[PDB]
Write a protein that binds this DNA or RNA. Structure first.
Ligand SMILES: [K+]
Ligand SMILES: [K+]
Ligand SMILES: [K+]
Ligand SMILES: [K+]
Ligand SMILES: [K+]
Ligand SMILES: [K+]
Ligand SMILES: [K+]
Ligand SMILES: [K+]
Ligand SMILES: [Mg+2]
Ligand SMILES: [Mg+2]
Ligand SMILES: [Mg+2]
Ligand SMILES: [Mg+2]
Ligand SMILES: [Mg+2]
Ligand SMILES: [Mg+2]
Ligand SMILES: [Mg+2]
Ligand SMILES: [Mg+2]
Ligand SMILES: [Mg+2]
Ligand SMILES: [Mg+2]
Ligand SMILES: [Mg+2]
Ligand SMILES: [Mg+2]
Ligand SMILES: [Mg+2]
Ligand SMILES: [Mg+2]
Ligand SMILES: [Mg+2]
Ligand SMILES: [Mg+2]
Ligand SMILES: [Mg+2]
Ligand SMILES: [Mg+2]
Ligand SMILES: [Mg+2]
Ligand SMILES: [Mg+2]
Ligand SMILES: [Mg+2]
Ligand SMILES: [Mg+2]
Ligand SMILES: [Mg+2]
Ligand SMILES: [Mg+2]
Ligand SMILES: [Mg+2]
Ligand SMILES: [Mg+2]
Ligand SMILES: [Mg+2]
Ligand SMILES: [Mg+2]
Ligand SMILES: [Mg+2]
Ligand SMILES: [Mg+2]
Ligand SMILES: [Mg+2]
Ligand SMILES: [Mg+2]
Ligand SMILES: [Mg+2]
Ligand SMILES: [Mg+2]
Ligand SMILES: [Mg+2]
Ligand SMILES: [Mg+2]
Ligand SMILES: [Mg+2]
Ligand SMILES: [Mg+2]
Ligand SMILES: [Mg+2]
Ligand SMILES: [Mg+2]
Ligand SMILES: [Zn+2]
Lengths: 305, 150, 110, 154, 118, 43
RNA sequence: GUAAAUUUAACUGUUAGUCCAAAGAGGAACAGCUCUUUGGACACUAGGAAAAAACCUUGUAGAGAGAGUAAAAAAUUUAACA
RNA sequence: CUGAACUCCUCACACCCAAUUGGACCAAUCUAUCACCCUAUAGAAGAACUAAUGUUAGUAUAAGUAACAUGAAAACAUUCUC
RNA sequence: CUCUUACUUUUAACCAGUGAAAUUGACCUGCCCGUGAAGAGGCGGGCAUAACACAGCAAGACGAGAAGACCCUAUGGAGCUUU
RNA sequence: CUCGAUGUUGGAUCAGGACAUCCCGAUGGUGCAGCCGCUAUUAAAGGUUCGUUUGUUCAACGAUUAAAGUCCUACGUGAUCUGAGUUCAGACCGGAGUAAUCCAGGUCGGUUUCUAUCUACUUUCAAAUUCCUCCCUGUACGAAAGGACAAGAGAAAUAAGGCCUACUUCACAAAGCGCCUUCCCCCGUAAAUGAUAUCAUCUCAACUUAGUAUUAUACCCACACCCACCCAAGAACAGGGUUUGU
């Protein structure tokens, strides 16, 4: 009835052995999935208007500046795809939703810290457990066989993506920091009233309206940034350079999807469909893909002639 | 009030009155005082009334006990085992006669709220109503919107 | 602000006896193998720790008598020697603290 | 908000915090084992590790001598640091101290820890020991290990 | 067949269902026509809910109500059915549904002019 | 909305009361009784 | 047709009034306003008018797992033209 | 058709108005005489408390809340910090 | 101040010890409209609705506190002034 | 209704609501050429400035703006704040009175308590409004003067939501003064075909178009390792990591 953990009863000799054993199994399992197209892939249909393909899960490496050919400076966020695989596929009818969904998980984690039901799910899948699992709505033609890895080249420079992540958590906060309230004067007689809400309602109603802005927990919630341009792709390290900043702290997992904004509808005609298969790819992609307007690091210094 | 007290259903003792009527009062125990104004009416009841009352009720054994007491009492016991004690303190001879006659006529069941003013073990002769009592039957017992011989 | 009405014992029992207010059962208690007294898994046994502290204090009191004053920390290593023992080869050049008792079985000479 | 704030708020402010930690560190150098509130020992442990590194620079390094002069309030301990403690750890690159939680303090139920410099002459603490290799689970794993090593050599 | 209910008069345009989310500005008013296209069972459900007694049994009674917008009924629901209730409204026949016997039985009431273009 | 000023059934502005069908029939029923009373008091 | 009335004897409390209908006065043919007058109701019960002192029905007191009633529900839909 | 405490039905009947007024009973206490497991007839009177921001005492609620306290290590010798 | 931000101490929050005060008819203590001694958590019509802590907030409970000090009244007082 | 108390102006803070609309949208009429206007219908999503004197709400004035709307909410809101004014006890001036003392007068000064028991509420998860610039164009219009609309492109402000590469306050981090993202709709009328009424008639006639969204999709979605440790998670609790438990 007392709780236990994985190495509680292990001896000095067995702890290193177990760590090495489980570590090697994880690496071997990841290496066995590197050839999706030689392992009975599902049908690869052509892209059609109205088709929605799967997205990725990436990690927020940090922020970096790049310069366009006109000389403007744009700061970008580095998003690295780490151990991203398709986990589960649910048909349109069974999802209970308008479209079929594809579950994707990224970032490998320790098996010792996962639940039994989760562990046995990954055992039949033949993959190590993932820190985060996200559900992507897709069309029938875009279905991918579970266990297929996904890379950063799935996204190509010049397209727009939507990034969703949990924001930085600031805990319980006052109305000034949380809601941008003006507060009260510092001097001129103010008595213990500088950062207080003030009046929260009118006298007649005799109650506080639901949804009233009050002190409370701030941050640590899911937010989406829409219409972020993909400036550059690094195929060697699988890092998607995206315009602007994304929600959440660096080293957090983010959900990357094709942009939903109406202006960017039906721009996937030239994008990999259903995804990018590096093994299938006839000609290996260059280590860096650049948008036409980006100043590449080795390009000559800008001249306005 | 009804919610603040117990209740029972109307009933009888051993189906009394069905085959024959049996008086349920079984014993009466009087406790009078030779001296004492409280028992004046009880002493006069023992002189002229108790003897004639016993002649009419040969199935009730009456025990008259004369002893010093401030409150004379009559204790009635019934065949079902119920025991009832009623004070006759300062009651007139006529008042006591009425009380004693009432005790003779009671069954001995608890004098509490009776849920229904009637009782029956055979409430239905033609069959108690059920949801199908007045529903017609259909050919082959087919349900609404049911394809037969598919 | 003052209470508008007395709070009933019924309301108070709900607050006071909420499972959040109750003491939680500890599942990390175990028997110390050395001494048999109870201990928590992540905490040193109180019985064994006290035993070590009592011997540590006796040695420190002896160190005091040898130093015989404040600001007299030695510039050499120290060894504790018990009745019936003599300095080893690796105990030469070290301050010797002598204890008038037999070496405790749990205090292995190193 | 205290994201990435690595130091605790102690004592009466920043200066008092250093002085509180310095007294703890001075006691440790003299006695080589002390007990104090868990949080304070955890804070002081980092300084106790770095002090040895300064001691390893030697008594001729003027910067090391100034550091030791500040942190050791009892000047007889400065020779001990350079000539006793630092030579003892000559062959180690770190891990000079061990910190263990002890039962809560009686008076105020404060969480408590014992800290000591490894290699001292004091009676050894009842250190936690991992299960024997001869236990049922460990023997079953030894079999699995033996089996995996034999299959690799083949 | 709750999707095929019929209102008399202009109730499709005039009858309004009012709700409030509870937030400031949360008052919502939709016509029966708008509600019907959004939720094909809401109208019948709301009519029943308002007719049931306003007590704690009401929501229990609602669990025994099974509304389906079309003829499709789950097989389990179909197997337990006992009796179908007669439709309260008699559906009037369209002019194209009358048999020639019925048309012939109704007399011609007037004689149109032979030279009228019609 | 739809408030009646002050108290409902008094004062200048009042809640309108309408005459139902059965209220009319009730009055006519008693008018018939009194009409007959007139007759039997005439002789 | 009815059963009260006056007188004798001995006393207390009430003497800060509300709405409704009606006849008027004041105000502004305002007031849930103010002032008199005739009557009613209320300040006592029950039913009704949605909740309801003042509108309507109805009063004399208990029990009943009977019955006949009183007052008692709001109706209405519209512009052609020589 | 439904629908009152109106009316009828079986049995019973002093048993639904503030101030005020008339009347019938009565708890406990003491005294006279009875009674003698707690009474009777009378004579008396500090003779009856859901309410006076009542008086005294007990214990609740607010509440285990507001608030309050001991510089550090150590051999308890001593030393250190301020 | 535009327009606020960061840090330290206090308080704070959690653990341990000790342990008050005003307040309190009873409470099994929702929202909207309407009603009403005329501004309803408690009435009518609707809607909402498993139970139970901790931390915040100050719109309401015509919140607590002081038998309103303003105003009027009492054949109620007192101070001062005076032809 | 309230005097065994329902705290009295203006401001600060945060605002909820009505539309009888100040700006932005859509329309009919004009003594509407155009640009500006006037007037009415429809529209309450969004917005509706900063200063000088004054206690002021107002008012006047300065500079702007697409516009600086009207009202209700205990003349919203003091258990959130402010106390210049009004309206106690002191004092002066003019005036009244024999005096005490007084006057809608002016003037200087003058203590704003509460530890939250109950109700309510504490991330409406996420579609954006507006000005200006270039261009159309010196075109349509007009005697001339003057001078657009629609589409197209760019750049800003505000609002909402995020972030730290640089700059700045700063420095394992939090921030703005910095940077990044931001997507539907408005129903007033204007027109055909065509009856009652064999023309005509946009029709509370049957009907046809401008003319309409099941507002869209998006977000969220597994769970007895869990004693302990760490944490960009956090008041506690919860949450993430430990394959980083000498
Ligand atoms: K009225
Ligand atoms: K009525
Ligand atoms: K700062
Ligand atoms: K409040
Ligand atoms: K008052
Ligand atoms: K001023
Ligand atoms: K309450
Ligand atoms: K016409
Ligand atoms: Mg945080
Ligand atoms: Mg400020
Ligand atoms: Mg103050
Ligand atoms: Mg202040
Ligand atoms: Mg009213
Ligand atoms: Mg009089
Ligand atoms: Mg009046
Ligand atoms: Mg009836
Ligand atoms: Mg009667
Ligand atoms: Mg009677
Ligand atoms: Mg008696
Ligand atoms: Mg007596
Ligand atoms: Mg008395
Ligand atoms: Mg009492
Ligand atoms: Mg009292
Ligand atoms: Mg409290
Ligand atoms: Mg405190
Ligand atoms: Mg202190
Ligand atoms: Mg607090
Ligand atoms: Mg405490
Ligand atoms: Mg009170
Ligand atoms: Mg109300
Ligand atoms: Mg609370
Ligand atoms: Mg507060
Ligand atoms: Mg109340
Ligand atoms: Mg109050
Ligand atoms: Mg008073
Ligand atoms: Mg006098
Ligand atoms: Mg009061
Ligand atoms: Mg507003
Ligand atoms: Mg309008
Ligand atoms: Mg106000
Ligand atoms: Mg205050
Ligand atoms: Mg207030
Ligand atoms: Mg002032
Ligand atoms: Mg003067
Ligand atoms: Mg002043
Ligand atoms: Mg243009
Ligand atoms: Mg035409
Ligand atoms: Mg025609
Ligand atoms: Zn032990």
């Amino acid at each position: 009835k007392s709780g236990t953990w994985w190495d509680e009863h292990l001896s000095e000799e067995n702890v290193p052995f177990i760590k090495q054993l489980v570590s090697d199994e994880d690496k071997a399992q990841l290496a066995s999935k590197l050839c999706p197209l030689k392992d009975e892939p599902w049908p690869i249909h052509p892209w059609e208007p109205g088709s929605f393909r799967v997205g990725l899960i990436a990690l927020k490496l940090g922020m970096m500046p790049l310069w366009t050919k006109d000389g403007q400076k744009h700061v970008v966020t580095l998003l690295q795809v780490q151990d991203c695989h398709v986990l589960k596929y649910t048909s349109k009818e069974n999802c209970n939703g308008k479209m079929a969904t594809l579950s994707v998980g990224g970032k490998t984690v320790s098996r010792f810290r996962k639940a039994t039901s989760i562990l046995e799910f990954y055992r039949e899948l033949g993959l190590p457990p993932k820190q985060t699992v996200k559900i992507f709505n897709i069309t029938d033609n875009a279905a991918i066989k579970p266990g297929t890895p996904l890379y950063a080249a799935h996204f190509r420079p010049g397209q727009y993506v939507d990034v969703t992540a949990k924001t930085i958590g600031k805990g319980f906060q006052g109305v000034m920091k949380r809601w941008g309230f003006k507060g009260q004067p510092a001097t001129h007689g103010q008595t213990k009233t500088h950062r207080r809400p003030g009046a929260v309602a009118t006298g007649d109603i005799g109650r506080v309206w639901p949804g009233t802005k009050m002190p409370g927990k701030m941050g640590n919630i899911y937010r989406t940034e829409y219409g972020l341009k993909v400036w550059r792709i690094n195929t060697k390290h699988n890092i998607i350079y995206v315009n602007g900043s994304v929600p959440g702290h660096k080293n957090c997992l983010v959900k990357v999807k094709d942009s939903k904004l109406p202006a960017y509808k039906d721009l996937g005609k030239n994008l990999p469909f259903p995804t990018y298969f590096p093994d299938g790819d006839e000609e290996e992609l260059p280590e860096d893909l650049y948008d036409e307007n980006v100043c590449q690091p080795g390009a000559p210094s800008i001249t306005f002639a | 009030t009804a919610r603040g007290t117990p209740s029972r259903f109307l009933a009888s003792v051993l189906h009394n009155g069905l085959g024959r009527y049996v008086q349920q009062l079984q014993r009466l125990s009087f406790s009078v005082s030779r001296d004492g104004a409280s028992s004046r009416g009880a002493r006069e009841f023992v002189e002229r009334e108790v003897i004639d009352f016993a002649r009419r009720n040969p199935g009730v054994v009456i025990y008259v006990n004369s002893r010093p007491c401030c409150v004379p009492r009559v204790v009635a016991e019934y065949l079902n085992g119920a025991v009832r004690e009623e004070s006759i303190h300062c009651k007139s001879v006529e008042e006591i006669s009425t009380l004693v006659q009432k005790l003779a006529d009671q069954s001995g069941l608890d004098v509490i709220r009776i849920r229904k003013p009637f009782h029956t073990d055979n409430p239905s002769i033609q069959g108690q109503w059920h949801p199908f009592t007045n529903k017609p039957t259909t050919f082959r017992g087919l349900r609404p919107r049911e394809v037969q011989d598919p | 602000a003052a209470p508008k009405n007395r709070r009933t014992i019924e309301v108070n029992r709900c607050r006071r006896r909420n499972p959040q207010k109750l003491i939680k059962v500890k599942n990390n208690i175990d028997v110390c193998p050395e001494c048999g007294h109870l201990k928590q898994k992540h905490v040193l046994c109180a019985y064994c720790y006290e035993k070590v502290c009592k011997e540590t204090a006796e040695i420190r009191r002896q160190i005091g008598k040898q130093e015989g004053g404040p600001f007299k920390a030695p510039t050499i290593e120290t060894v504790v020697l018990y009745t019936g023992e003599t300095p080893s080869e690796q105990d030469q050049g070290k301050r010797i603290i002598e204890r008038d008792r037999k070496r405790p079985s749990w205090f292995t000479q190193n | 908000i205290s994201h990435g704030r690595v130091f605790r708020r102690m004592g009466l402010g920043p200066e008092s915090r250093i002085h509180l930690l310095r007294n703890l560190l001075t006691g440790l150098v003299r006695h080589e084992r002390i007990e104090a509130p868990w949080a304070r020992v955890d804070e002081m442990r980092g300084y106790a590790e770095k002090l040895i590194d300064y001691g390893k620079l030697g008594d001729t390094n003027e910067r090391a001598m100034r550091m030791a002069d500040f942190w050791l309030t009892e000047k007889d301990l400065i020779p001990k640091l350079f000539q006793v403690l630092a030579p003892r750890y000559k062959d180690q690159t770190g891990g000079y101290t061990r910190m263990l939680q002890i039962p809560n303090r009686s008076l105020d139920r404060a969480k408590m820890a014992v800290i000591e410099y490894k290699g001292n002459c004091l009676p050894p603490l009842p250190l936690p020991r991992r299960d024997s290799h001869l236990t049922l689970l460990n023997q079953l794993l030894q079999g699995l290990r033996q089996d995996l090593r034999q299959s690799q050599e083949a | 067949n709750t999707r095929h209910i019929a209102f008399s008069g202009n109730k499709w345009e005039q009858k309004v269902y009012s709700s409030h989310t509870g937030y400031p500005g949360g008052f919502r008013q939709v016509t029966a026509a708008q509600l019907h296209l959004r939720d094909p069972v809401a109208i019948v459900k709301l009519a029943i809910y308002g007719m049931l007694p306003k007590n704690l049994h009401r929501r229990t009674m609602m669990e025994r109500l099974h509304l389906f917008p079309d003829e499709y009924i789950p097989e389990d629901i179909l197997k337990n059915l006992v009796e179908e209730l007669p439709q309260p409204r008699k559906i009037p026949k369209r002019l194209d549904e009358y048999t020639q016997e019925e048309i012939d039985a109704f007399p011609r009431l007037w004689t149109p002019p032979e030279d009228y273009r019609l | 909305r739809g408030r009646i000023p002050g108290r409902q059934w008094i004062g200048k502005h009042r809640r309108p009361r309408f005459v139902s069908l059965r209220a009319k029939q009730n009055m006519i029923r008693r008018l018939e009784i009194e009409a007959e009373n007139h007759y039997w008091l005439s002789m």
